[PDB]
């Protein structure tokens, strides 16, 4: 009857004093990170001689190693750095998105998503060229222009924290320009990962599953609402809730630009807004696993 009041005042005191400390550990760490952030990380990527319209022209022009290359899809636009994948499935793969560690923030506004952000490539160690890829989003303007050059196929790859890997191939892939809210369109699926983009989340049902189809969706970012989620409430936007820009529906079956959870497993009380943000591909691992690797690669399509 009365043991309960002091038994509370014992435990409640303990937890609060525990947390006070946790706050101090956290104040410490943020202090530290800010100090290191007074100076940048660096790279030195000597540009390969061989260039081209995109990674497939380059592979056919004799560029056989997987590194950063300078491509120029059109004379109108100036050349830019991209990481070509020359080893996977006959190569010539132009990386448009990449995840492998948590090095780059993906919770970015519209403009950075349009322009592209992150590191295209880092130094391989003991070498003057950058043969390893960074975490990057290529940029919508660039991604759009690449796909509308002709039939373009998409290769999405991913790896769990235990080393198993699967893939979600798409035979046709198109992204329209900014005036069309970078509308996505995919078709002709094969692969082991599960068709999250066309069909929605393999585990949901009927109208629930349908609201997770990305095909046909518009691109949205935390500062530009273009999801299939029609509400009056500012905080009720997928890119605000699932963290970072994507072709969100209501909201997603697949979230490759999500927050990078170390370990894999994560839960709803770990998440900023409780929603399943993070590198999710429901059709494979469900809503509460967060991939160790995730990458989107494009190439021209030959039937």
């Amino acid at each position: 009857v009365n043991s309960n009041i002091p038994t509370n005042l014992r435990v409640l005191r303990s937890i609060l004093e525990n947390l006070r400390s946790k706050i101090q550990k956290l104040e410490s760490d943020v202090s530290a990170q800010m100090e290191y952030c007074r100076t940048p990380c660096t790279v030195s990527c000597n540009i390969p001689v061989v260039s081209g319209k995109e990674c497939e022209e380059i592979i056919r022009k004799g560029g056989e190693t997987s590194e950063m290359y300078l491509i120029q899809p059109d004379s109108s636009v100036k050349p830019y750095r991209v990481y070509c994948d020359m080893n996977t499935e006959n190569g010539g793969w132009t990386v448009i998105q990449n995840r492998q560690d948590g090095s780059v923030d993906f919770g970015r506004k519209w403009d950075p998503y349009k322009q592209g952000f992150g590191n295209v490539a880092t130094n391989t160690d003991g070498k003057n060229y950058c043969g390893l890829p960074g975490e990057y989003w290529l940029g919508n303007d660039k991604i759009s222009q690449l796909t509308r050059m002709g039939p373009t196929e998409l290769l999405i790859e991913m790896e769990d924290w235990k080393g198993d890997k699967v893939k979600a191939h798409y035979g046709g892939f198109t992204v329209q320009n900014e005036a069309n809210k970078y509308q996505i369109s995919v078709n002709k699926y094969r692969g082991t990962a599960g068709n999250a983009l066309m069909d929605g989340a393999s585990q949901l049902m009927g109208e629930n599953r349908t609201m997770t189809i990305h095909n046909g969706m518009f691109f949205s970012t935390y500062d530009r609402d273009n999801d299939g989620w029609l509400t009056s409430d500012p905080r009720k936007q997928c890119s605000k809730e699932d963290g970072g820009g994507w072709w969100y529906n209501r909201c997603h079956a697949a979230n490759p630009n999500g927050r990078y959870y170390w370990g894999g497993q994560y839960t709803w009380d770990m998440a900023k807004h409780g929603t399943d943000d993070g590198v999710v591909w429901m059709n494979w691992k469900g809503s509460w696993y967060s991939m160790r690797k995730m990458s989107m690669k494009i190439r021209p399509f030959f039937p």
Binding site: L204, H252, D276
Partner: peptide
């Protein structure tokens, strides 16, 4: 995920 979805959202109803």
């Amino acid at each position: 995920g979805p959202r109803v």
